Amino acid sequence: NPCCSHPCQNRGVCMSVGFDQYKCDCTRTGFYGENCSTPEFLTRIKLFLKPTPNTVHYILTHFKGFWNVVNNIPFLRNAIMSYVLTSRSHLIDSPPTYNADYGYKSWEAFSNLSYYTRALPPVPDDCPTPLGVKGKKQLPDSNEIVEKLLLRRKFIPDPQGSNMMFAFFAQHFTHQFFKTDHKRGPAFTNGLGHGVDLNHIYGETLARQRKLRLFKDGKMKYQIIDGEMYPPTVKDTQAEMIYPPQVPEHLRFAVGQEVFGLVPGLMMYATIWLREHNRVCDVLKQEHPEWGDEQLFQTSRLILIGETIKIVIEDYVQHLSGYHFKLKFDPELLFNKQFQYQNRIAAEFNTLYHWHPLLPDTFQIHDQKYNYQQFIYNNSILLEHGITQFVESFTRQIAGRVAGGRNVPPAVQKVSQASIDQSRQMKYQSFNEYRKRFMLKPYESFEELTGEKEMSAELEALYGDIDAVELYPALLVEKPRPDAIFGETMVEVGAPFSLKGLMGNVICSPAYWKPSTFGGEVGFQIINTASIQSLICNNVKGCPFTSFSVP
Amino acid sequence: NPCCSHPCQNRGVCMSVGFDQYKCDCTRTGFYGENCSTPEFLTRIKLFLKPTPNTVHYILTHFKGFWNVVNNIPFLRNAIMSYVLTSRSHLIDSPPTYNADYGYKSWEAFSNLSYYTRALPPVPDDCPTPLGVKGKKQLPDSNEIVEKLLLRRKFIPDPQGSNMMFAFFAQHFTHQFFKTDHKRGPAFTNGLGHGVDLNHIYGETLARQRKLRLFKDGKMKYQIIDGEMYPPTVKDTQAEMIYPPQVPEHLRFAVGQEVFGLVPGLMMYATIWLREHNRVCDVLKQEHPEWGDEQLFQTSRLILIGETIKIVIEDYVQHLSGYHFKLKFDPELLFNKQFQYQNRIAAEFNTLYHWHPLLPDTFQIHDQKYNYQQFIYNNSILLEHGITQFVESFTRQIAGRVAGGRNVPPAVQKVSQASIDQSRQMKYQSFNEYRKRFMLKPYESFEELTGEKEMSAELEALYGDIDAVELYPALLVEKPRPDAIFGETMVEVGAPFSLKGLMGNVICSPAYWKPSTFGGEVGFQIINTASIQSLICNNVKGCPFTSFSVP
Numbered sequence A, B: 001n002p003c004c005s006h007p008c009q010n011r012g013v014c015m016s017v018g019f020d021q022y023k024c025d026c027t028r029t030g031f032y033g034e035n036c037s038t039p040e041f042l043t044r045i046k047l048f049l050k051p052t053p054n055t056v057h058y059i060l061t062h063f064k065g066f067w068n069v070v071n072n073i074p075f076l077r078n079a080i081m082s083y084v085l086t087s088r089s090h091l092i093d094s095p096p097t098y099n100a101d102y103g104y105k106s107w108e109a110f111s112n113l114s115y116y117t118r119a120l121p122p123v124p125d126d127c128p129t130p131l132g133v134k135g136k137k138q139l140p141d142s143n144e145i146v147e148k149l150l151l152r153r154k155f156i157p158d159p160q161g162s163n164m165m166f167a168f169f170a171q172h173f174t175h176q177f178f179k180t181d182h183k184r185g186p187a188f189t190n191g192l193g194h195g196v197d198l199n200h201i202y203g204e205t206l207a208r209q210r211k212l213r214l215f216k217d218g219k220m221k222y223q224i225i226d227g228e229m230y231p232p233t234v235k236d237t238q239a240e241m242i243y244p245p246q247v248p249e250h251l252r253f254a255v256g257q258e259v260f261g262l263v264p265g266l267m268m269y270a271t272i273w274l275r276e277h278n279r280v281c282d283v284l285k286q287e288h289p290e291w292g293d294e295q296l297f298q299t300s301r302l303i304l305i306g307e308t309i310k311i312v313i314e315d316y317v318q319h320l321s322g323y324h325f326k327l328k329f330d331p332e333l334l335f336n337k338q339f340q341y342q343n344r345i346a347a348e349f350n351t352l353y354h355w356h357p358l359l360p361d362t363f364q365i366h367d368q369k370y371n372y373q374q375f376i377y378n379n380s381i382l383l384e385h386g387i388t389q390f391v392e393s394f395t396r397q398i399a400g401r402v403a404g405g406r407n408v409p410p411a412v413q414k415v416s417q418a419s420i421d422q423s424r425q426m427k428y429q430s431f432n433e434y435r436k437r438f439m440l441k442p443y444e445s446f447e448e449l450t451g452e453k454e455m456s457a458e459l460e461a462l463y464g465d466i467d468a469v470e471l472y473p474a475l476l477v478e479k480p481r482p483d484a485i486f487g488e489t490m491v492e493v494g495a496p497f498s499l500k501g502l503m504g505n506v507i508c509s510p511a512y513w514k515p516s517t518f519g520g521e522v523g524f525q526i527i528n529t530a531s532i533q534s535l536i537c538n539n540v541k542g543c544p545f546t547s548f549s550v551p
């Protein structure tokens, strides 16, 4: 297959014509030629005026006093934020295109919501190498990659100061749209909403939602333990959860996402958001004593979806970017712009979000330590310390650096290896192919990638060719930005997927983004004043200080 | 419920505030005030300058010499067509909002694809009258309405000259997205693609697609009967169909849509489109001898989707409109515009498309006459005459006038009664409400509605209040445009639903609309040169002349 070499550049569509020839479709690429390499006149101007992402990152992470003024000039802040959204979103195809089984556009790939979609098509089946033509006939042994390049020696904390509040928020929030159906294989998802629908609170199906709801005052079922609200039990809801048999029946908490029993950190956030739901129910009953249970529940869900997107943009991504520029959640920014209010979760977005180097060596709650053997599937820890102590503790505990390499804990070693194996099953193109897909310069050497001698040598010994390095491994060994948590590629690939899932939500569309959608101005204001601190303050006893960075 | 009277004007959203008050949300309506009835300044200017629909319709249906010139000035014709697409599409909320069970915006209404969506929300179930506050406490007997106002006495031919090729194309085409799940109720659909996916050829599910395919050269199963290609049978495919016990096995043809055995006119188009898929397979194999069966099938389906949109816009809606301006299917018209490439089928779109008055009292094939008892579920008629004969006969046979009243054949009398009854189950608002929803002045009298005295008196005796007249009856008795098949409301309410389903298709999006999507220029050109005449010429023996109107 002539397209195995990935000849077409700049988003050109490679199509085989005959057995030994190929064609490139350069339509609206801004280029022409056999391989869509020759820039058009306009493209040539743009390409010359366009700054490198590293430049843009320098500018955004510097000149603090300037940004603090820009942030307070609504016309400027809005104009900038609006550009961030439109420009990054242009990198995602929407409606979506390829999936694991289709390197060409097809109706099966478009319409079948059980697939993750794909930003780059799969390497065709009959190719010289796994990645196409580059690399050896067989990719290196995955466990060797982990040990040599990813496995943690000594803990490397995050220079940006990310804490466990941040790490578990990342895990909790993304696991509503990262829900791969492993009975089927890594190419499939159970999250058919394909974004921020809060199914990890309310359940994926109406059947599960009905088991978790109280059907009084719009509320969700709960227990009162030690004078505080917790999730209901599997016994009381009949909502299936994943628990090893060791777990006693009373500690089997039931929440929207089957798997959130895995760690108390997840169940901490499930509890916090559950409280928030029932709190907003109380607020809306005041505003609407005439409302029934159903409308109270639905309107609370829509408000909580708003809070989530609000908090994710203005607190979580804000922290994660390190920008002095204050990011904004404002759907009105896009009303005069071209933008598709839909989304489809990309498998590559799932792959890049395996931030297990975030995880510490031990989990430190109050004046105690817990190893993974003790921490996993142990909600006894959650009831013992309470949410307040959990927030106090997780706020102060530093997370690990994700880029730079050699920082995956041994406990989740096999998870990192699984990430590589599964991407091979799905036939991911190479790391450098994905760089080009998101308009980055491909690395010319293992050293340029790592900015370093050891790993770059280990890498060359494993792969040989720089164009043979796989997507997942390279992301974790890539040279981090100065004192940053991520390298260049993580940010430039990840941000477009993220923003599209966030602003592509139906509530951001003009038909929805009205106060009447959320019960009036009071409900609407809950969205637009939401923060990670306020989430904790309204729902955690004592209103402890919190933040996604260590004090 | 203070919203029962539908207080809020001009798209304002009504919301209860306490037990005895409401608030109108006027956001982006272009109005303000308690009921959103006060125009803003720009609104005042737009209203003053905007010509009425009947004025626009007059202009488009006169001055042929002028339009012949306009038609041949591409810059101009493109601008007009582009304007037609965007202005009509604005009348549809996309992503969708209400459904039968939600008069307020909710995640259930947005996310559950099993529902028909709703242009106007349902009337609350605790209102003083079934339509809100206007009209009597009980609605007229639906059988009375049908008999007094809708039932046919003498056939009334369509003045626009629509033939049976048109009537069965209408039925064939729309029943791919009008597929209500009566197991659940009228509010639910089995067409989860919500638009033009050609499931009525290939099947809704992958399981059904697999039964119908040949898995050789990307083709669909078929039979050769008297020299020509026909669809396969239930027995050979195992794809279930609806047939009465009378029909012998070997005549139980199996096609995408389960109900297309109901009438030979549908089975004709199913045959023609089946031939077209396999014809396109032959074309593509020649272009791509290296392609396997899968890519040949998928690429063929994408091409035929395009052919469908092409034909519907430039032949079907063209004829339908009565315009001298020449409509154009060109996804490029929208690439610089704001437009959502998605669609959700409106229940009201389904209701208004109940065009059973199109139907004759008898069906004339060649020199034979068939009444309903012998025409229904009779596929031997199809084998008897063959497709060429069917086309020639149907191209000649005139269809009935849809608007103007009293033109529903007695045979499908109960279907027309089911349409009224189901509207009431789903709590449709009134005709006048839907007129305001689509920016039409509400009718002040029944006489104004029908343009006559007789029918308007039955109407008044049945309903009492002009604001109590229901959507579906009013659509069919409404005064038709001069020598037209429809009145003002059918056109102005239906056109936006239609255009959104057509241009909102994924293939019309910029990522898909390019030659490589369709296997190159040869395939891309089958779409862009497709017409109802070429469809027939390529797949019907003898290449008989055809058209959507009688010679």
Ligand code: COH
Pocket (backbone or CB within 6 Å): A167, A168, A170, A171, A174, A178, A179, A180, A262, A263, A265, A350, A353, A354, A355, A356, A358, A359, A376, A412, A415, A418
């Ligand atoms: C910030 C990101 C983050 C965090 C903090 C986190 C925290 C933790 C954690 C304890 C706190 C444990 C014990 C694990 C362990 C696992 N993780 Co993560 N995970 C994270 C991101 C992910 C993502 C993303 C996936 C893929 C889930 C999917 O695709 O469904 C994942 C998958 C897994 C799997 C599935 C294995 C497989 O074969 O795919 C295991 C096991 N893990 N992880």
Ligand code: COH
Pocket (backbone or CB within 6 Å): B167, B168, B170, B171, B174, B178, B179, B180, B262, B263, B265, B350, B353, B354, B355, B356, B358, B359, B376, B412, B415, B418, B419
């Ligand atoms: C638009 C043109 C058109 C035509 C020409 C047409 C021609 C014919 C025809 C013979 C030629 C027959 C025997 C029927 C008979 C029926 N039609 Co139509 N139908 C048409 C548009 C529709 C639509 C739209 C529906 C609703 C489909 C659905 O799934 O609800 C429909 C529904 C029906 C139903 C189901 C009614 C119910 O239970 O709700 C029957 C029976 N019929 N129709």
Ligand SMILES: *[C@@H]1O[C@H](CO)[C@@H](O[C@@H]2O[C@H](CO)[C@@H](O[C@H]3O[C@H](CO)[C@@H](O)[C@H](O)[C@@H]3O)[C@H](O)[C@H]2NC(C)=O)[C@H](O)[C@H]1NC(C)=O
Pocket (backbone or CB within 6 Å): A205, A206, A207, B112, B114, B184, B185
């Ligand atoms: C889209 O909306 C549909 C209508 O609400 C919904 O279908 C409904 O689903 C429920 C349960 O899923 C069915 O009722 C069930 O009720 C008892 C609970 O006590 C169960 O034990 C029963 O087994 C029964 O299944 C409703 O009958 C059903 N209604 C209809 C009209 O089909 C769909 O589930 C919604 N779709 C999604 C994806 O959520």
Ligand SMILES: *[C@@H]1O[C@H](CO)[C@@H](O[C@@H]2O[C@H](CO)[C@@H](O[C@H]3O[C@H](CO)[C@@H](O)[C@H](O)[C@@H]3O)[C@H](O)[C@H]2NC(C)=O)[C@H](O)[C@H]1NC(C)=O
Pocket (backbone or CB within 6 Å): A112, A113, A114, A115, A184, B205, B206, B207
């Ligand atoms: C979305 O794509 C999925 C993957 O192709 C698809 O799932 C597949 O569905 C087929 C048929 O529905 C299954 O094949 C069946 O084949 C025989 C019956 O002849 C049985 O023995 C099998 O057990 C099975 O029922 C595939 O196994 C299945 N593949 C996977 C990975 O689940 C979905 O159906 C597609 N979604 C839609 C809405 O069409």
Ligand SMILES: CCCCCCCCO[C@@H]1O[C@H](CO)[C@@H](O)[C@H](O)[C@H]1O
Pocket (backbone or CB within 6 Å): A276, A307, A525, A526, A527, A529, A530, A531, A534, A535, A536, A538, A539
């Ligand atoms: C739980 C996260 C929700 C975000 C809301 C943050 C504010 C929480 O506090 C709220 O502040 C409002 C003013 O904005 C007041 O009107 C409310 O009375 C008060 O409850």
Ligand SMILES: O=C(O)c1ccccc1Nc1cccc(C(F)(F)F)c1
Pocket (backbone or CB within 6 Å): A084, A088, A317, A320, A321, A327, A490, A491, A492, A493, A494, A495, A498, A499
């Ligand atoms: O938001 C995520 O989930 C994200 C994930 C991975 C990588 C980058 C991510 N967001 C991000 C990172 C830097 C800058 C911006 C932007 F400012 F564009 F929003 C967004």
Ligand SMILES: O=C(O)c1ccccc1Nc1cccc(C(F)(F)F)c1
Pocket (backbone or CB within 6 Å): B084, B088, B317, B320, B321, B327, B490, B491, B492, B493, B494, B495, B498, B499
């Ligand atoms: O296209 C349909 O199926 C249609 C249905 C009902 C009513 C009008 C319809 N179309 C339509 C009727 C008149 C003019 C135009 C338009 F010109 F806008 F395209 C479209």
Ligand SMILES: *[C@@H]1O[C@H](CO)[C@@H](O)[C@H](O)[C@H]1NC(C)=O
Pocket (backbone or CB within 6 Å): A373, A374, A375, A378, A380, A381, A382, A384
């Ligand atoms: C779970 O946590 C409790 C403390 O809350 C501890 O006593 C117990 O040993 C833990 N379980 C395991 C398996 O370590």
Ligand SMILES: *[C@@H]1O[C@H](CO)[C@@H](O)[C@H](O)[C@H]1NC(C)=O
Pocket (backbone or CB within 6 Å): B373, B374, B375, B378, B380, B381, B382, B384
């Ligand atoms: C079906 O059509 C054929 C004509 O080919 C006719 O002989 C037969 O009587 C018809 N069936 C019925 C039930 O009328």
Ligand SMILES: [N+]
Pocket (backbone or CB within 6 Å): A011, A012, A013
């Ligand atoms: N592409």
Ligand SMILES: [N+]
Pocket (backbone or CB within 6 Å): A040, A041, A042
């Ligand atoms: N150029």
Ligand SMILES: [N+]
Pocket (backbone or CB within 6 Å): A207, A208, A211, A238, A239, A240
């Ligand atoms: N469940």
Ligand SMILES: [N+]
Pocket (backbone or CB within 6 Å): A371, A372, A373, A411
């Ligand atoms: N451990």
Ligand SMILES: [N+]
Pocket (backbone or CB within 6 Å): A159, A482, A483, A484
């Ligand atoms: N550093």
Ligand SMILES: [N+]
Pocket (backbone or CB within 6 Å): B011, B012, B013
């Ligand atoms: N609305």
Ligand SMILES: [N+]
Pocket (backbone or CB within 6 Å): B207, B208, B238, B239, B240
């Ligand atoms: N089937």
